[PDB]
Write a protein that binds this DNA or RNA. Structure first.
Lengths: 287, 287, 286, 284, 289, 287
DNA sequence: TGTATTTCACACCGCACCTCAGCGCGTTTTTTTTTTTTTT
DNA sequence: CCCCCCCGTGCGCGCTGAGGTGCGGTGTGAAATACA
């Protein structure tokens, strides 16, 4: 019985972080119970157009908000989302199982996070079924990164995801992958800016976000990869996780990483400058 | 009043589950006999745009309705959609014909449906003309899952169908297909997220849905596929099958599957949480 | 003075089955002489949009109408549209010249049309210039199907012509085509749904329609196609159907097939006994 | 005197046969000096949309008009748009020079134009540089038919240019071209509808337009082409004409063909009824 | 702040010859200190659509204005826009350097500019760095024709240029470009029309403009281009002008070409009848209202 | 009257140099607190279209402004913009270390800037990791140029950026890149016009912006490229510099270039800028 | 009884409100393109 | 001879013009108050 207001629906959509078309349409039509704006939305002869614009607008808002946040603020906004209970002792026990003292790994992650160039890629190289996939992919899951797949490297759009995410991982790199890295992506693995081709739009020149790679092939030994000995940090995982112990004796969850970052806020050198004293407030495109 | 009202058209099109534009337009022009909104629509000089919006809204509603169901609800809906005359005897008789107990198949099916990692691929290995594809095609028809095709693996978009359906079938996997699974797509058999493209879209990262493959090759006997012995459950098909007057001595219906799942809702351990609304008015708030 | 009304224009377009846009525009601008709505169209300020929308609406109507006709009704609607006068005698005498009893071809059509799996492909085998392509392509043309092309099997885009039509012809299937059928379309000849793929689009999962394949290779004698024995009914076209002395005595115009069907509605196990009121309601789809 | 009337502008545009967008827009802005409607058009704030729609409408009318016309009427049209004055003497002397009585060419064109299967391909077969390509190309241009090319045979996609035009030609058909005609384009010479595989399109089922082949290979003589013995009217070219002599390397201009048709209606058998008797056309 | 008059904006754009969108928009918005129509445009809330339409209209007007000109009058125009004090001795000495006396090139240009078929392409074939691309590009720049490029032969839009320009050119003619000339653009050399596919609205039944090509592949010798043998006039540049050990090499300038045409007007046979009727006494304002 | 004023929004966007849709939309939504016009914007029913048009208009303005500046004026405009503290002494010591007197580099730069034909490509060729990448990347960063990547070369659209900027670089060009330059990019590198294709827009015939390339592969020495000895200039970097880890004398900053150009305004033949007689230029408005 | 001194009373003429719907209204690269690997 | 359920809401941004209705800027007097 009132005039539709697109802004209210954009704000409500952003409240629940609904971005895709079908979800916003379905959830709003189900929410027409106690939302007079929704009941004004249903009887409008341009529902589809409004859904399309609402999704686009929420996408703009979320993309800009994510891009704005600096690394300490981003890891804070992800320690907020890490739900569960569990200490960091799993991390230390796993690394001592792999006979790698923690301090080296901390002294490499410290640099890797800052994107210091020539140190912008970890390598976890070891035999299959050694526990590189679980660790690396969990660390990507807790940093909200995207997995890059080498299957479609013949389509040069496979690097499109590097325009958004903050920790990319390509897993089980073959020899062709290492040669590809040495030959094409010399700049990105260095850390220097590199162009990114995207779909239907314009190429965006961006920094090279931090990476992670797991591969059976060692690179600190193959002398034909002489240009990668100094540009990566290789940690050797040479022991098996899935041993005779019934379950995988070591498994890693968001609680482990969350308490890992809360306890190691200092030794990773993370800090926001001065102002964290207020009551909550956020973008409000509703009026 | 005679003014056309788009919400009514969307409600009607969703009502009978017409998604494609042509069927909506034809059926609605037919229904114009006894629908005031329809006899209004025929005269609205912007018919094509209304039809396109109605089809798009129905597609949005249906797609976001299917993805909002957890697995037991999905199987319940598929059982509700299946009609015919049959029983589970018309299946267990076939299994006893191939000389495999059914209890082992159930102990495997439970895990396979739950998507548990490292146990999320059933391989049916048998010589040609023993009935593999018959059982697999029947089962994947019931689960409403798509079937892949290793023909197009030169063109990396053959995985595009993996983004929607919840039970993928790959029939007649050659040596090349098994090597591809061993090298590239190990993550899916594990159960870790993978990246998949969709023609004119972006690589949507999703968990890999359960699979079902038929191959003459015994992966659990070869030595090149040593790293698949811990990600594949196999069932051997040995006794002969269809060679008799164009009638395979065993054809698996949908009534068979319906009575199978319904009769074994306890052994497969499928259930829902605290329930106080099952057989009620369907939420048709899309009007 | 006379407002435009898109409804009566789409009704007029559907009256004459003017699907394509240019024909709409030209014929309607011509008809403006004695149709007030057409003068309103001519004076209208957005003519091209109306032509485009009319084309789209007519295409929707016609395509949906085709997809909704059950197989006996569609055979009746393809029997109505075939024009010419002839006789089934050409089919009968062609077969009896190939020393093949007609009753064999009937007892194969009875199944091949019903889509029964494992009996849903009719192969015509014989050395070339024996009349295979004559009968096969005449029959596919009657059924309104689409002639496929085994050549482009380097690409997987050559099955795209089966997303719509209800009968396909694969002409001169050599060993490569037979191997391709035995390897990737094992399902199709078994009637169960297949996964076709088109160019610059997504794959669709549809039932495999019936088929007619012409080949020089007796699959039911080969051994590597041991699987193919159970889903292909061979037909031995041996005699020379073409010119015995310079002029091809035998050719199957649409009238021959039409009279064949009309006289053989019973033995094919179909039904066209509607005869409802006079011909049919067929009121309107304005 | 206001409210620019788009119907008038499209009627005028078809009136002057202005089809391309740029011509319509420019000349109309030029005629706006003495045309009130054009002066209204200039002040309109959406001139581009009007120009685009006018081009689309004129193209619709002209394309439908061209497609509608039947073959006797179509030739009666293309026998006027042929410009300039010539003389059939050149074509007669050319054919007499090639030892072919022109009566033979008339009695073969009689079949070839009707599209009658079993007689729907003319092979102008002779040694290189004997005027075969000259004559075939002149005749095919007169009909305004697309000239094909078998040098693109490495793909199937050399047939997509045949979707529209009413006549065809292939240049110096090698054995591969004859093999292609014998194997894959069998229907086109028999009258049945054949599929056409192009790039980023679909198998368009269109009838075969009448064909015309230039080759050095006498298909009527080889024994591995029994299926083309009866669907081809091969013509013999022996004597050379397209040489560098002080005399005429005989030219065959469109006017030559114009006078040829004008004189050869009677023996070429094209009907004249079902006309409109100078009934104009309009779009308003 | 009176109602925006899109006609006035298009008139201003075509007056200043601004065609591309960005230059139109920015230059107009900078002229708001004196044009009431400029503030009128700034006031509206649909600036992008208006600038898009203005660009398209100016494009139409320039396109037709150029294509109206006849090639003799077009050479007159391109001989007015040439300024300097050049001489034709440079081109004569360049040709006599390569041992091809100028009369041959004159007797080829006469036939080429007339666009007669079978003679509608000159290939300047020679080893790298002998003076082929220098002369080719000098003549093309003077004649205002658009220089094509083969690096993008995919997407099939590399041909829209010669839909509206009077002399195209393709340098670095690799084997693939020769193959395209053999199997795609035969109609271009044969005089027959070719359908050039513009990238936004529709193709054109445009006749192929006179061409030019620089290559090292002596197509008059390779038998794989038997069709291309007899439809190009090959001029062979064997003597090189790559003198890196002293005096400066040749360079042909616009004024050199202008003096060449002015001097050899009669021998090049350019004469469109006249222009003296009552249509062109003094009427000049025909631009627009 | 508190209605939206698109002119105000476009002027503001250009005022802050916001270009892309995401930044302008989100940050203006934030500004809607105390910028009455943005508060009106939030209530508009076509927010997305207005955001898109604002992005397009700001692109038009920025592009047509930058393309106007003559090259020495561009260098001056970047010169004032360059902030920080540093001197030209860094560049002098770096080059005099490499056993190249600075006069050689200066007399090559004074030609490279003007795009003089046959000297329009300055390649820094030397043994691996001797300190070339840092210098080329820093100079391109100062001149506001773009750095392409070779990976896109399978798509011809990777040169779309050449129609805008005035200093183009590709770094670590492989051997296929050298063949590409010798075969397709002949005229452009010689000093001629060349066509450029772009996405959704028309192709333009624009001259070739000056270039900088680095590689370990020599082009003046390999007789395969007998065709590039007279059209490029090659500087041989030989000493061990590129560590950035142990001593790092190649630590080039942007203030290095700023004071380089400020101190070399007579021997770079640049004084005759667009500011030959600069007595009144203070003007700026694009309402 | 003659006459200064003033709002109600029917209204010139209206400033300006609200009231409809006939005028404007839209995206298309990327993949596929046959190109030369991709075992042999 | 009187109560055991039908019922899930409102529209192309924006105009804008004839239409007529009213309390007043101004229509401006015979009646009406009080004077002398």
């Amino acid at each position: 019985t009132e005039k539709f207001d697109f802004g209210t629906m954009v704000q409500w959509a952003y409240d629940h972080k609904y971005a895709e078309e079908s979800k916003i349409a379905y959830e709003y039509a189900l929410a027409a119970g106690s939302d007079s704006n929704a009941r004004a939305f249903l009887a409008t002869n341009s529902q589809a157009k409004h859904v399309k614009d609402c999704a686009t607008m929420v996408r703009h808002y979320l993309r800009a908000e994510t891009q704005a946040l600096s690394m300490p603020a981003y890891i804070k906004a992800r320690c907020k989302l890490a739900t569960g209970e569990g200490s960091w002792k799993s991390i230390l026990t796993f690394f001592n199982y792999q006979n790698i003292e923690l301090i080296t790994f901390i002294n490499a992650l410290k640099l890797w996070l800052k994107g210091i160039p020539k140190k912008n890629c970890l390598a976890f190289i070891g035999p299959p079924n050694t526990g590189k996939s679980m660790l690396c992919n969990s660390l990507i899951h807790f940093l909200g990164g995207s997995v890059l797949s080498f299957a479609n490297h013949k389509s040069h759009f496979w690097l499109a995801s590097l325009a958004d995410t903050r920790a990319a991982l390509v897993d089980d790199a073959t020899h062709a992958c290492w040669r590809y890295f040495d030959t094409y992506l010399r700049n990105a693995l260095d850390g220097y800016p590199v162009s990114i081709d995207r779909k239907h739009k314009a190429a965006v020149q961006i920094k090279a976000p931090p990476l992670l790679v797991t591969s059976n092939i060692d690179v600190q030994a193959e002398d034909r990869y002489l240009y990668l000995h100094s540009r990566v940090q290789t940690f050797r995982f040479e022991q098996p996780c899935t041993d005779e112990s019934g379950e995988q004796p070591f498994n890693i969850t968001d609680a482990d990483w969350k308490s890992f970052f809360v306890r190691l806020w200092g030794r990773l050198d993370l800090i926001d400058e001065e102002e964290d004293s207020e009551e909550d407030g956020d973008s409000m495109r509703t009026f």
